[PDB]
Design a protein around this nucleic acid. Structure first.
Ligand SMILES: [Mg+2]
Ligand SMILES: [Mg+2]
Lengths: 313, 68, 104, 227, 144, 184, 143
RNA sequence: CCGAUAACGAACGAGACUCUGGCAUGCUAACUAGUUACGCGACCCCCGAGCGGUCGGCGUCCCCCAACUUCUUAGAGGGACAA
């Protein structure tokens, strides 16, 4: 009985938007890490045809920007990019304060810790590093990590049982503990490379996606397995609803939303295709982010637009 | 005008597609990075010429059964 | 000590020159030296152009030869009794060195 | 400090010293397989390394010849006494050196035999010494009174672009025969393989190599391994 | 008020000439090498120099303080470098310190009039070759 | 609004011919302060169609060989000519320049080697041909004469825009039309 | 206000300063000022009776906005293109004597002196009365 | 180059390649390159306005009596492939 309806687009940057970040403390700003080497803060002014206006652009990255996050107080922003370095921004005119001279090759994902004290980055040079908040790395992990590119890396949202997960093109869902950065489980069962993982707001279950098309759920406490549900083509993004169930996934040029008590598809969200010339495959969706209240979802597409989806009825 | 790819690019791209089809897609930059890290290509221009032809060939494969 | 000295490195080969500068600088920085980094003086290109033929017959073709010189400067802040041995272990036969005091 | 020379003139003079030393040492010990020289200049006693093929006669009786060579070098180039020392090293894979092979061809021609037979022998020795390809040209008053040229190419050989600056090596000799001179031109294309001493690193720019994948087995039903 | 450190430094180029504009927070003063814009070189191209302030009006420039130094090039090349530097400096100052929509509107009103106000012209000069007086021209050829 | 040279407001001129209003650039979007820019108008075909007309006139005025880079001279030559024209007739100098370009461009031409057939003229060749004829007429009128180049250009433009068989340009246009008619 | 030398037009600034400098009759003018030919790359000694005052004016202005100049700097400043018969043209320097004489005459007015390095530079008196003339000419043009 | 095919598999030349031009407010840096800021010193205006204007005047790495690299230099990388 619940449907999602798009209340307009956010235009304003020409590139593949690759990441959307939202904050719980101030629900009028979002971030857009895109492929034109910029990050955009938006004024979410709920209007007609003006649902968002760009408010400040953050530059300083040499090449494509891969990931972005927000601190718990919503004052600092951290972002990694394809020039092999991380960069800690802020509000109040958005000048970078610290930069993390890191991996040899380019990073793919960053993640704030639960207390905004530990900084982690997964990169294409097949290493993962945990960082101090002032710039210095504590120590990298090597020679038991993935033997392929380390894709998306996420922290467990709870301070209890500090857990960090790491997908990759090794087709493994390697999970590390924050006490000594040793391996604790070695999840196997994917058939292609992995694009992303996401941990639920309770630190109990995580979902992994990739070239398989299976949004393949896991468990964290007992950590053996859960049910696997398969949606469509290539899986780009995964995020759980913040207050509620209905995990969503970005599968090709459409996003599929699934409940968890029962495994039915809840809704199909597509852009309305106009002037079908049967030549160009439709623009994919590259990123998803809830607005920390479960009311609106921002979906980042592979053209230069990001769409907002609003719950109805 | 004058953008024909030589047989070096074409046969390198064909062997790359044949061996590493699972890790490639229709995106030029990720294909560029994959071809960078799975093959010793001596120059950058040759590298991303090969990556461009790999992208074109994967669009062709996603349409239908070309060789292959 | 405390002596300010300056090391001048010149070569015709860029990569080997930068190797020498890098290894000398990291050997200084590990030894608790305050070092001012390698200042690259503008490169000098010597540009003899000649007539390419031994006789005077033909279509007036010319050869264009050139030789390039690259310079760097490194500054050190300790006596010579460690810098002489730290530069004697970085030779790399294309590089020619003057070591000089800031007083010179 | 007292006497000073600008850096342009200093580097040009260093190159001129290398050129004159190499030409004199070519002219002197050509019958010993000279094949190049290296100088190691330093603001102290310098070294000059001679890359001969047969070092046992570059060094004379108890090293007399090397001693008189360092004497003439120190007396001509105005080095202070003891500031120059002269070394000798045997070159590995003499069949891959163009200067030594051109001298071997000159030796055979001066000894007198068919030009065909000498060039064939030199060419096949170069091939079984490990070259990717060779090219031997002899030009001059061959059998007859009118000059010809004859080339004995074999294998693989590049001609154009930047790779032919470091990846082949050439040599030109003159042979003072009974009726005019013959010209000898030997080109040897070197192998790449070891990225070491026998050839160069950085292979030919249009040679790509693709590593083969692994087995990639067990994509089947999910299992988890805990620690 | 008197909020300090509100300044940017933006360059503009025309074939050798580099003009770097320092845009402080002041009140409507613009000067090139210490002299005003109306007391400048040949003044045939004076409108070519003050067309950004005519397009954007004096209200956009009323809160800034531009100071431009320029080196290299010729007379005309320096004129073009100056005006490109002023326009790009105003765009940078607006984007770093006021709202982004204002930067967008000044930027696009500059783009629909003479794009070189914001994008440098890349064409530099061609080398002389050894068979003639210039890059392309060749010496006169005689047959008999 | 833009009002070229600080006077002579631009949005009142009318180009009567359809064929040439597609290729004459004095309208409001090609309305600029000076007839000088580093245009890069020669990079492709028909990019000179969107170069403004006054700058094409200044470009063709910078020609006989002793004047090849001297563009500021031709800018002030055109400025003085425009003041002389507005002072003589009271009409907008842009309008009379446009009328001169309309009236001086030939509409039929003949070409071959074995001038055999008479062909038609593209409505970009006649713009180029009109500008070339006007500048040539001004150049030849001012050569060994006390009259300066500015009022020679001015009288060339006013006589061509009226149409008098007294400009060099319209004499040449009529002669080209006549020769083309002879073998049509 | 304002104003300085920099923000007024330099042509009538030189005209006004030469008028002021001629009006106060203390500038020492040599006896050969009508047979000079002024920098041998040109002929026909200038079409002015009072070229010396304007030359002293432009020398004072140039020393105001770029100090430390000597006779070589001035003979480079007032140089020009020498048309050279049927041979092509070249650049020739100015007359050294007229530069030395205008410098010495301006030193006689206590508005320039030899600085600690080579060359000359304005006194505080010199930049004071040049800024006063600049104020005069700027007020004349604006009103 | 695609294809066709009594030819198949190759080799040189072309292309690749090397140098140069154009872009990086991103990196590494610089008293033999500077820029901002500050403090002195000259002039202009003032009635006082003044954190006013000009300065290729001086100084701020003999050690804090300042930071920084936009402009200059040149290293590493990026960037364009008909994507
Ligand atoms: Mg070639
Ligand atoms: Mg020329």
């Amino acid at each position: 009985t619940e449907q999602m309806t798009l209340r307009g687009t956010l235009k304003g940057h020409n590139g593949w938007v690759t990441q959307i970040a939202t904050t719980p403390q101030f629900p009028d700003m979002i971030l857009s890490a895109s492929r034109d080497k910029t990050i955009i803060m938006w004024k979410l002014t709920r209007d007609e045809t003006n649902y968002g206006i760009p408010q400040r652009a953050l530059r300083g990255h040499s090449h494509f920007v891969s990931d972005v996050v927000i601190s718990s107080d919503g004052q600092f922003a951290l972002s990694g990019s394809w020039d092999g370095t991380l960069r800690l921004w802020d509000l109040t005119t958005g000048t970078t304060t610290r930069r993390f001279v890191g991996h040899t090759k380019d990073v793919l994902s960053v993640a704030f810790s639960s207390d905004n004290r530990q900084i982690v980055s997964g990169s294409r040079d097949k290493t993962i590093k945990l960082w101090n908040t002032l710039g210095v790395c504590k120590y990298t992990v090597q020679d038991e990590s993935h033997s392929e590119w380390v894709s998306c890396v996420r922290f467990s949202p709870n301070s209890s049982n500090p857990i960090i997960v790491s997908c990759g093109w090794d087709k493994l869902v390697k999970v590390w503990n924050l006490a000594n950065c040793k391996l604790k489980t070695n999840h196997i069962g994917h058939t292609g490379y992995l694009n992303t993982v996401t941990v639920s707001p309770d630190g109990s279950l995580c979902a992994s996606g990739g070239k398989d098309g299976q949004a393949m759920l896991w468990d964290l406490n007992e950590g053996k397995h859960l049910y696997t549900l398969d949606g469509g083509d290539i899986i780009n993004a995964l995020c759980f609803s913040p207050n509620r169930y209905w995990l969503c996934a970005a599968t090709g040029p459409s996003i599929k939303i699934w409940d968890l008590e029962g495994k039915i598809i809840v809704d199909e969200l597509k852009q309305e295709v106009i002037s079908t010339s049967s030549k160009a495959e439709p623009p994919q969706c590259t990123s998803l982010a809830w607005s920390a209240d479960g009311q609106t979802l921002f979906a980042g597409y592979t053209d230069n637009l990001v769409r907002v989806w609003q719950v109805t009825i | 005008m004058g953008r024909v790819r030589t047989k070096t690019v074409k046969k390198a791209a064909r062997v790359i597609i044949e061996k590493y089809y699972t890790r490639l897609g229709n995106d030029f930059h990720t294909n560029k990075r994959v071809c960078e890290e799975i093959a010793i290509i001596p120059s950058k221009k040759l590298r991303n010429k090969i990556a461009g032809y790999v992208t074109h060939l994967m669009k062709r494969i996603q349409r239908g059964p070309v060789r292959g | 000590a405390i002596h300010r000295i300056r090391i001048t490195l010149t070569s015709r080969n860029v990569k080997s020159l930068e190797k020498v500068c890098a290894d000398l600088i990291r050997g200084a920085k590990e030894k608790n030296l305050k070092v001012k980094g390698p200042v690259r003086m503008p490169t000098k290109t010597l540009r003899i152009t000649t007539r390419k033929t031994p006789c005077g017959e033909g279509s007036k073709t010319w050869d264009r030869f050139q030789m390039r010189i690259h310079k760097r400067l490194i500054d050190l802040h300790s006596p010579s009794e460690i810098v002489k041995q730290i530069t004697s272990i970085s030779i790399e036969p294309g590089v020619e060195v003057e070591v000089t005091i800031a007083d010179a | 400090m007292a006497v000073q020379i600008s850096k342009k003139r200093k580097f040009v003079a260093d190159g001129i010293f290398k050129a004159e030393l190499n030409e004199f040492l070519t002219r002197e010990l050509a019958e010993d397989g000279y094949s190049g020289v290296e100088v190691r200049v330093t603001p102290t006693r310098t070294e000059i390394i001679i890359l001969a093929t047969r070092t046992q006669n570059v060094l004379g009786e108890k090293g007399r010849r090397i001693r008189e060579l360092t004497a003439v070098v120190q007396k001509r180039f105005g080095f202070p006494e003891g500031s120059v020392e002269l070394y000798a090293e045997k070159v590995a894979t003499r069949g891959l050196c163009a200067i030594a092979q051109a001298e071997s061809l000159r030796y055979k021609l001066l000894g007198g035999l068919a030009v065909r037979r000498a060039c064939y022998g030199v060419l096949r020795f170069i091939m079984e010494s490990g070259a990717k390809g060779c090219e031997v040209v002899v030009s001059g008053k061959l059998r007859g009174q009118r000059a010809k040229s004859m080339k004995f190419v074999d294998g693989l050989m590049i001609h154009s672009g930047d790779p032919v600056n470091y990846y082949v090596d050439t040599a030109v000799r003159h042979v003072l025969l009974r009726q005019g001179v013959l010209g000898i031109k030997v080109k040897i294309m070197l192998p790449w393989d070891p990225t070491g001493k026998i050839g160069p690193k950085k292979p030919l720019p249009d040679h790509v190599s693709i590593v083969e994948p692994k087995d990639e087995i067990l994509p089947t039903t999910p299992i988890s391994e805990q620690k | 008020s008197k909020g300090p450190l509100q300044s940017v430094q933006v360059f503009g180029r025309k074939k050798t000439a580099t003009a770097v504009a320092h845009c402080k927070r002041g009140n409507g003063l613009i000067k090139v090498n210490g002299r005003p814009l109306e007391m400048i070189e040949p003044r045939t191209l004076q409108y070519k120099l003050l067309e950004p302030v005519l397009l954007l009006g004096k209200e956009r420039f009323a809160g800034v303080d531009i100071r431009v130094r320029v080196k290299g090039g010729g007379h005309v090349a320096q004129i073009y470098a100056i005006r490109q530097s002023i326009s790009k400096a105003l765009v940078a100052y607006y984007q770093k310190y006021v709202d982004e929509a204002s930067k967008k509107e000044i930027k696009d009103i500059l783009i629909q009039y003479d794009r070189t106000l914001l994008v440098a012209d890349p064409r530099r000069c061609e080398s002389k070759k050894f068979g003639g007086p210039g890059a392309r021209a060749r010496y006169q050829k005689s047959y008999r | 609004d833009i009002k070229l040279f600080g006077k002579w407001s631009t949005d009142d001129v009318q180009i009567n011919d359809i064929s040439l209003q597609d290729y004459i650039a004095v309208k409001e979007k090609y309305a600029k302060y000076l007839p000088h820019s580093a245009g890069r108008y020669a990079a492709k075909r028909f990019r000179k169609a969107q170069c403004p007309i006054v700058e094409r006139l200044t470009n063709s005025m910078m020609m006989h060989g002793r004047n090849n880079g001297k563009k500021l001279m031709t800018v002030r030559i055109v400025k003085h000519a425009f003041e002389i024209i507005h002072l003589l007739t009271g009409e907008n100098p842009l309008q009379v320049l446009v009328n001169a370009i309309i009236n001086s461009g030939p509409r039929e031409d003949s070409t071959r080697i074995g001038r055999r057939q008479a062909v038609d003229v593209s409505p970009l060749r006649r713009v180029n041909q009109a500008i070339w004829l006007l500048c040539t007429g001004a150049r030849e009128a001012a050569f060994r004469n006390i009259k300066t180049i500015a009022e020679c250009l001015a009288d060339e433009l006013i006589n061509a825009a009226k149409g008098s068989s007294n400009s060099y340009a319209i004499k040449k246009k009529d002669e080209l039309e006549r020769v083309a008619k002879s073998n049509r | 206000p304002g104003v300085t030398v920099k923000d007024v037009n330099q042509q009538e600034f030189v005209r006004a300063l030469a008028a002021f400098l001629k009006k106060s009759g203390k500038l020492k003018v040599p006896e050969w000022v009508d047979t000079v030919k002024l920098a041998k790359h040109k002929e026909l000694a200038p079409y002015d009776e009072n070229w010396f005052y304007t030359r002293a004016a432009s020398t004072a202005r140039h020393l105001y906005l770029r100090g430390g100049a000597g006779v070589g700097s001035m003979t480079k400043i007032y140089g020009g293109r020498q048309r050279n018969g049927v041979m092509p043209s070249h650049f020739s320097r100015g007359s050294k004597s007229v530069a030395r004489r205008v410098l010495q005459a301006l030193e006689g007015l206590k508005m320039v002196e030899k600085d600690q390095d080579g060359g000359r530079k304005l006194t505080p008196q010199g930049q004071r009365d040049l800024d006063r003339i600049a104020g005069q000419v700027a007020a004349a043009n604006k009103k």
